[PDB]
Amino acid sequence: AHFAPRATFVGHNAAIESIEIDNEHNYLVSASRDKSALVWKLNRTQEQWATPFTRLIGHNHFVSDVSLSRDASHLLTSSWDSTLRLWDLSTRTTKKLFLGHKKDVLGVTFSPCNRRIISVGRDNQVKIWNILGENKAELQCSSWVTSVACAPMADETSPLVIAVGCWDGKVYIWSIEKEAKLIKEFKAHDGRCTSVDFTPDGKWVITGSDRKVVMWLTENGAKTISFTAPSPVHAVAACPTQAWICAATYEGIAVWDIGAKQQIDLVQPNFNAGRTPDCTCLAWAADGSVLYSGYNDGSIRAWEV
Amino acid sequence: RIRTKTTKRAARLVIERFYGQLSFDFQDNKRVCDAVADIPSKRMRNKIAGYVTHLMRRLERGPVRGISFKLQEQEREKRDNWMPTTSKLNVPKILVDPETKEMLAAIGLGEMEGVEVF
RNA sequence: UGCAUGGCCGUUGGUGGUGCGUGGGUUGACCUGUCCGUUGAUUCAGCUAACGAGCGAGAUUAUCGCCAAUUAUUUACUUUGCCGAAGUCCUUCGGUUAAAGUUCUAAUUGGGACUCCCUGCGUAGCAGGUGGAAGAGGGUAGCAAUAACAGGUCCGUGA
C-alpha cells in the first residue's frame, strides 16, 4: 500500500550520489557530491527525524559510493579521486587509504562477513582488496562499471556472488571461492546499464538506460520478467522483507508488486523550463519499515508503509 | 562568454556518434568527452561538455536543427514509412462548385456520379 | 647620407580585422563570398549566387588565488620527549642526527568553474541568485594577422 511523507531533512549542500544504512536502525550515511560524507542518527521524534553526527573530510572530489561494516564501526567510501578511504566510525580519522586504482572509482561493497572489499571504476576492472589493504584479484571487463552488489549471507563457505552493471550494456555475474570464475555473462541492457541490486533470497538479480527494469537469474542467466518504467531510472533496490521492487525515475518512484506484476504506486512529493529534482539513489532500511531516497538538489526524504 | 566555432562543431559531432552515452548531468559528460575525443587541455573539455549538456535539454523537446544522432534516424524511418488505411480521397459524393461543373461538361465527362453546387 | 639599405623597435590600431581555390555578376576599375539579434571580438546564431579552405580573435604559454597525493630529524617548520635558565604546582623562553610527522615552508604531477544549476528576459545568449577558494574571458600579464608610415637608429655591431 501507499505511504505518506514522514520527514524531509537536509544538511548537505551539493547533490547526493549514493546512500546506505547501518544494521538494525539509527546511523545512515549519505555519500555526497560535495566530497564530504556525513553520518546521521535517527531520533524519529515528530519534527526532526535525524541530526548529523560526523563529517568525513579527506577526498579531493565527489564521494561516489559508501559501504558499511556489519558492526557499524569501520565504514569505507570512494571517490573520483581514484582512491578509497577506511574511516573509523567513532573518531573519523582515515585508517588507511587504497592505492592502485587509476581512474575515478564508482562502486564499493563489503562481503556479508567483512572479508573482501570490492572497489570498481573506469579502469575496466573490479579490484578485490583485503580488509588489511592489499590487492588480491583483478577481474576484467569490456567497458566502464557503474555499480556493484553482493549476495546476502552465504555462511562463509558459499560463494559470495558479485553482480556488475556496465556502461556499454553488459551485465557480468561472478563467483569467488578463491579464483573467482564468472557464472555467466550477458547483454543485459540495450544501451547503458545504470544500477544493480540483488533480491534478498538471491535466486534473482536486478539491473536497468532504456526505460526497462529487468530481473534476471543468478544461476545461470536469462530473464524471468521485463517491466517498462515511464522515464529512465538511475537506481534500483528491492525490499528486504516483503515482495516489492522499486526504481527511481524522474517522474517518481515506481513501486512494483512483483507477484501482482504491476506498478501499484508512484510517489513524488510536490514542488517553467526547469528540470526540478531527480532522485539518484534509494535505500531500504534493514527491517523493511522505511524507504529513504537521496535527491539532486541535496536533500533526503523518508516514507514509511 | 560565447562558445566558439571549434567547440560547437566538436560538440555536435560528439552527439552525432555517442548519444548512446551521455546524460543531462555535466559531471558525467565531462568524463565521457575525455574518452570519446582526444583533447589537449582541461579547459577545452569543460566547455565542450558544457555545450553537450546544453543540447541534451534542448533535445528533451522538438528536434534540433543541424544535428542527427542515429536513434531519431531509425525513429524517423518508421514514422515515415507507414500510410493509413483507405485512400481518404473519397467523399465519396464530392462537392463541386457551379462553374467547375460546367468545366466537367466541357471535358466530356458529366454524369460522373459526383455531386454538384451545394 | 636613416631621402641608398639590412635587422630591431615605436606607431596607424592590440582595434577586429585581413585576404586565397573553384563558381557567379560586370565591357571594366571591381564586387559577391566577407550579409536581422547576440558578444570584448568577421564572437556565434541564422539569412543567402555562392560553397569550401585558411591567418588574426579564441585555444595555448606564464604567474597569482583554493585543494591532497608525492617527498623532507643536518638547507623549512610543528608536536611530543629529554637537559638548561627564570616562574618558582606547571606558565614562558633557548637548545637537541630523538621519536613521530606535514597545519605553516619549499615545488613537481593532477583535481577545480562549464552560464552546469534555478528564476526572469530574448534559438545565439543576457540579467539576477544559490552554492562555491573562485562566477561570468576567475584576476594580471605574455604572444599577436595582412597592409603601410621617405616617423626612429649608418653615435650598438666583424650589418
How far CA A15 is from CA of A9, A36, A176, A260, A297, in Å, comes to 14, 11, 34, 35, 5
A35 touches chain B (CB under 8 A): no
A234 in reach of chain B (CB within 8 A) = no
What is the spatial distance between Cα A31 and Cα A16, in angstroms, rounded to a whole number?
Answer: 6
Angle value at C-alpha A20, between A15 and A25, nearest 5 degrees: 130
The range of the structural domain enclosing residue A109 comes to 6-305
Rounded Cα distance between A75 and A60, Å, is: 18
Burial class (CB in 10 A: 0-12, 13-18, 19+), A63: buried
Sign of the alpha-carbon torsion through B27, B32, B33, B38:
positive
A301: cell is 526524504
What is the resolution in angstroms?
A: 3.3
Among candidates A241, A231, A257, A248, which has minimal Cα distance to A195?
A: A248
Q: How far is CA A43 from CA A28, A270, A285, A304, in A?
A: 12, 25, 15, 15
Burial of A13 (0-12, 13-18, 19+ CB in 10 A): exposed
How far apart CA A118 and CA A156 sit, in angstroms, is 16
* Residue-wise burial string across A214-226, b where 16 or more C-beta atoms lie within 10 A, e elsewhere: bbbbbeeeeeeee
Contact A120, A107 (CB under 8 A): yes
Is residue A191 a part of any domain in this protein? yes
Looking at residue A147, which CATH number applies to its domain? 2.130.10.10
Identify which of A62, A104, A191 has the shortest CB distance to residue B20: A191
Residue B17 Cα distances to B10, B35, B56, B66, angstroms: 11, 13, 14, 14
Q: Which amino acid, residue A55? A: R
Cα A80 to Cα A65: distance, rounded to the nearest angstrom? 10
Plot region of A273 (φ>0 → left; ψ -120 to 50 → alpha; else → beta): left
What is the distance in angstroms measured between the alpha-carbon CA of A59 and the sugar C1' of C79?
25
Residue A152: CB atoms within 10 A of its CB come to 14
Show contacts of A225-234: CB within 8 Å, 24+ apart. A225/A261, A227/A256, A229/A254, A230/A254, A230/A266, A232/A194, A233/A194, A233/A195, A233/A208, A234/A194, A234/A195, A234/A278, A234/A279, A234/A280, A234/A281
Measured from Cα to the C1' atom, the residue closest to C120 is A272
Judge contact between A117 and A165, C-beta under 8 A.
no
Domain limits for position B38: 1-60
Q: Report whether the peptide linkage leading into residue B63 is cis, meaning its omega lies within 30 degrees of zero.
A: no
Which residues, in sequence order, are CB contacts of B54 under 8 Å at separation 6+? none
Asked, for residue A253, whether it belongs to a domain, the answer is yes
Is-contact A274 A262, C-beta < 8 A?
no
* In the block, residue with C-alpha cell 567483512: A114
In whole angstroms, what separates CA A16 from the centre of its chain?
12
- Cβ of residue B114 lies below 7 Å from strand C: no
Which string of DSSP letters, residue by residue, matches A169-187?
A: S-EEEE--TTT--EEEEE-
Q: CB within 8 A of A137, min separation 6: which ones? A: A127, A128, A180
**C1' (C80) to CA (A21) span, angstroms:** 39
**Which residues 34 to 93 of B reach strand C, CB within 7 A?**
40-44, 46-47, 50-51, 53-54, 57-58, 61, 65-66
Q: Quickly count: other Cβ atoms within 10 Å of residue A6's Cβ.
A: 15
CATH number of B43's domain:
1.10.60.20
Domain annotation covers residue A1: no
**Calpha distance B51→B61 (Å, rounded):** 16
Q: Could you tell me if residue A69 is left (phi over 0), alpha (psi between -120 and 50 degrees) or otherwise beta?
A: beta
Cβ neighbours of A233 in B, within 8 Å: none
Which residues are bridge partners to A148 per DSSP?
A164
CB atoms within 10 A of CB A72: 16
Method: cryo-EM
Count of domains for chain A: 1
Let me know if residue A281 belongs to a domain.
yes
- Taking the C-alpha atoms of residue A143 and residue A183, their distance in angstroms, rounded to an integer, is 19
Nearest to A112 by CA among A157, A151, A144: A151
If DSSP codes are grouped into helix, strand and coil, which group holds residue B52? helix
CB B117 within 8 A of CB B96: yes
